Structure 1
């Protein structure tokens, strides 16, 4: 299944047309189904040709010459399919050698705001389409939220660092194009408690099992019993989790109650039984006395005998139905149900798993939409997640090649009229001098964090619509930070990619809870997630680093941990060019807000466009999502201005 694989790698069903293809090829969709079969084959085959060699441009001509008969005879259809694929960035995207050098005459002018992955991806596309494009970037470097620290042989990512599975991932293509080294993340992640001692394999698995069950329960509660609203307020994942925990505690307490009652019932039956036995002893004494007096005794002794014995066919008979209780009793007082749902130490380990979830969503669980937080799960790529051994920055740096990028240029105003656009920016090195760039269209890749800024960092004239600002307000924008510790010696286990630090309290569960071992040099990356992320930004590097070494010394022993030669600490929330790490579906929002974020603003025809991780519903908060949003917008714009 080569062509079938190509469709999959392109996130398309290999045996049916998509709604997009239906719209652009209505004559094929509403026509002979045999022609559709031909369409899909041409499409899947063209993708395969591109994917088999993503370093060279795939021309219409080369596609035609490589298609087998009878396909290579339907010249017009092939061109229609090749043009569509190229326009929408499914082929000839990223970085590749052009065999068809760009035309000197550039049509249309578009200003891209932001030189991150989405802006860069869109820039390259628009340029290859022959448009005049200039990127305005506030920072003194490209990449935005993909940021790599490089000094000597030290390499460490302060922004994105993980690639999520290559099957269907556009980054699989870009990876090949820029020669970026990826390493699969080894699963083993040992956990250490606050005292530094390792958590036994048993408990680790037990608690992780509960975590999974707890999450599965919130999903049931949400997508079955429709428990998504309470007191007119939307329910958060954090909220639901604490409720499911309470129920577990209730159940445990109920089984404890029932058990104690079995004990008390058995204890009462015994006491009462012992009491009638004591009276039967007193009744037997009444006989082992009296019984022995006269001459008719040959009949009086017989009588007193078959009488005193019958009272033993009664007594030791009770001692029998007594041993069946002392047995039942001791059996119960030896097999008590769980005393608690989670021991104090168990709850701390569970909180480590919640912190891990707060890391992934870049936000405290109490802010996540119970119903939509995993809204995009159905789009995950297949395969092991990987890490970028040589620094993720190699991607935006390569994507910037040949582009007209203006660094240290912060945009402050965006004007858009029915007949043109004006973008006003200022030199960040001398806020005195401003710049005024005229253009036909503006592509805004500003982070959701900057769009939410109050007072606004950049002004829109006219101001953005209410349906856009409302969506910007509902959507969540998280935070996550890292501390880079550069040593001259490796004191950790080189075979382990990650290990966790279990915090003491629920509130600080995200503080330096996870350490990563990913590079050539002796470097460790520690994460600060959830509530701890924003708070820790208020601590100086020295103090935060010291707390790290304290954790590390507790695990590997002091004297084993030398002072770091180099350290880097990120503060994404305080970073004015980001104001956070990435978006998350907030309680009260939904995946639709991502679609609303993608919508262009048009007074008589589309003028203001949007790209970025926050504008792509099926791939939010990721580098590939940023990439795809950029490819998407370049297509929408070329369609408007080039036809």
Structure 2
């Protein structure tokens, strides 16, 4: 019945907020729609796989908040395999390489590729992390899709294809679906192109031993009976002295404040009294989540390593069901596996098939790319289509279509009376990730602490000390990378 704060949503953001408030001495309740915690993270356990992450999984350098929270909960990380060569598969052919970027040999194509990545970071430097709508050219860039930007920037089809794959993989949406301003903000707030795409020294460096689902599970252990499972919130009433929160199974909760720790659009599932202010009312109908199926194919042995392949594949073309893979073998070297993402329109297209039909397509692709008949003999298969989830709406995160970020963006984390907004979408650093979920939950919890007169205003936003276990190398450029001309630049010099 009665408490200090109701937290709506038991994913990482909601759990991190609840933990902070509980540690501060307040009475908290977490209302969770599902029969489990974790939300967009989900660790499946069975004898065949031991454990596998079917949602959010990877962590890396500069993600100091998730690393600190996980460590405090007794969790450890291990390194994703990147010892051997990566593969770039293009026009039906495999090209092995080392380092973060697939090499380019044609001098014109080289100039075009270099300029694209450089320009993305160049543009990003003009976009404030905490206010992308304040970029000098905000409106111009927001009224443009990424597809339009790519058409303007890329003078070769080779650069445009890779850039397109990059967009699809980053935000699980088509280039024509997303705002240019929003996408450039998204990459920038993760630390730039190199940081976001890299395994070693980047976002895909590490996973948690035992799965990321343990973060939410272990906080639930700490909170005990304060977490209420199968309690979808349907109604929030702010007309009286105390806030009233009603669930689908007819329970009523009373609190001084509420944290909404759900994806922005999922706010539509709640009936508000009084009605939301105009801007938020419309915003929450304008912000969809992407489309993805996460697939893991298991093998007797990590056979690709014997051919000096690490298991990373970058696979171009419409025919390929999966555009990107990583080695998903356990740190001990057993439960050999390849993880792949089926992205955007392909997720929608291939969802019509059966599980067995999808397994076959993936194995035939991997056999081709790795040049190995062993890829055709899987021992097990696990997959998850996030598009079908009523209480997620998709994965990995919310994207903004053209025009939306400049018009509605400032309302994302603006409080509505006694409701405060968490969730990874409201973060300013690694928004879209588990790291962003921790930032947003803890920040929202502190906003309430300030509202109660318990902490000063300057303590709402808190910096995080660097992890000693996962240190960050700085991102470097070469002299030639900085000063080599673009294709139109070279033509101008001619």
TM range, normalised to the smaller chain? 0.7 to 0.9
CA-CA distance at 1:378 after TM superposition? 5.1
Residues 172, 290 of structure 2: 8 Å contact kept? yes
Q: Secondary structure at the match of 2:150?
A: helix
- For residues 407 and 425 of structure 2, what CA distance do their matches in structure 1 show? 11
Greater shift in the superposed pair: 150-159 or 543-552:
150-159
CA-CA distance at 1:416 after TM superposition? 2.1
Residues 501, 551 of structure 1: 8 Å contact kept? no
- For residues 380 and 252 of structure 2, what CA distance do their matches in structure 1 show? 41
CA-CA distance at 1:444 after TM superposition? 1.1
The answer for the alignment partner of 2:26 in structure 1 is 131
- In structure 1, the gaps of 5 or more residues are 1-105, 249-340, 427-432
Alignment of 1:560 onto 2:458? no
Q: Secondary structure at the match of 1:373?
A: helix
Of 407, 410, 426, 1:615 maps to 426
Give 1 or 2 for the bigger CA radius of gyration.
1
* Equivalent residues in 2 for 1:329-478, closer than 5 Å: 341-342=156-157, 346=158, 351-375=161-185, 379-380=189-190, 383-385=201-203, 386-390=205-209, 391-403=211-223, 404-426=226-248, 433-451=249-267, 456-478=268-290
Q: Secondary structure at the match of 1:417?
A: coil
Alignment of 1:210 onto 2:112? yes
- For residues 591 and 123 of structure 1, what CA distance do their matches in structure 2 show? 31
Q: Could you list the per-position Cα deviations for residues 528-567 of structure 1 after superposition, in whole angstroms to 9, with x for gaps in the alignment?
A: 1233233333333222211101102223456413543332
Residues 572, 580 of structure 1: 8 Å contact kept? yes
The answer for the alignment partner of 1:517 in structure 2 is 327
The answer for the alignment partner of 2:467 in structure 1 is none
Give the alignment's TM-score, normalised by structure 1. Answer: 0.59
CA-CA distance at 1:121 after TM superposition? 0.4
Question: Which has a greater percent of helix?
Answer: 1
- For residues 358 and 209 of structure 1, what CA distance do their matches in structure 2 show? 23
CA-CA distance at 1:239 after TM superposition? 0.9
Is the alpha carbon distance of 1:185 and 1:595 closer, same or farther for their aligned partners in structure 2, counting shifts above 3 Å? farther
Give the alignment's TM-score, normalised by structure 2. Answer: 0.75
Of 27, 52, 57, 1:156 maps to 52
Alignment of 1:499 onto 2:309? no
Is the alpha carbon distance of 1:171 and 1:209 closer, same or farther for their aligned partners in structure 2, counting shifts above 3 Å? farther
Greater shift in the superposed pair: 466-475 or 197-206:
197-206
- For residues 418 and 181 of structure 1, what CA distance do their matches in structure 2 show? 47
Residues 125, 634 of structure 1: 8 Å contact kept? yes
- For residues 531 and 615 of structure 1, what CA distance do their matches in structure 2 show? 26
The answer for the alignment partner of 1:543 in structure 2 is 357
CA-CA distance at 1:517 after TM superposition? 0.5
Q: Secondary structure at the match of 2:15?
A: helix
Of 210, 235, 240, 2:149 maps to 240
Is the alpha carbon distance of 1:352 and 1:547 closer, same or farther for their aligned partners in structure 2, counting shifts above 3 Å? farther
Is the alpha carbon distance of 1:593 and 1:540 closer, same or farther for their aligned partners in structure 2, counting shifts above 3 Å? farther
Residues 142, 406 of structure 2: 8 Å contact kept? no
Alignment of 1:179 onto 2:105? no
CA RMSD of aligned residues (A): 3.4
Is the alpha carbon distance of 1:424 and 1:107 closer, same or farther for their aligned partners in structure 2, counting shifts above 3 Å? closer
The answer for the alignment partner of 1:326 in structure 2 is none
- In structure 2, the gaps of 5 or more residues are 128-135, 196-200, 455-494
Residues 80, 207 of structure 2: 8 Å contact kept? no
- For residues 209 and 595 of structure 1, what CA distance do their matches in structure 2 show? 37
Count matched residues: 419
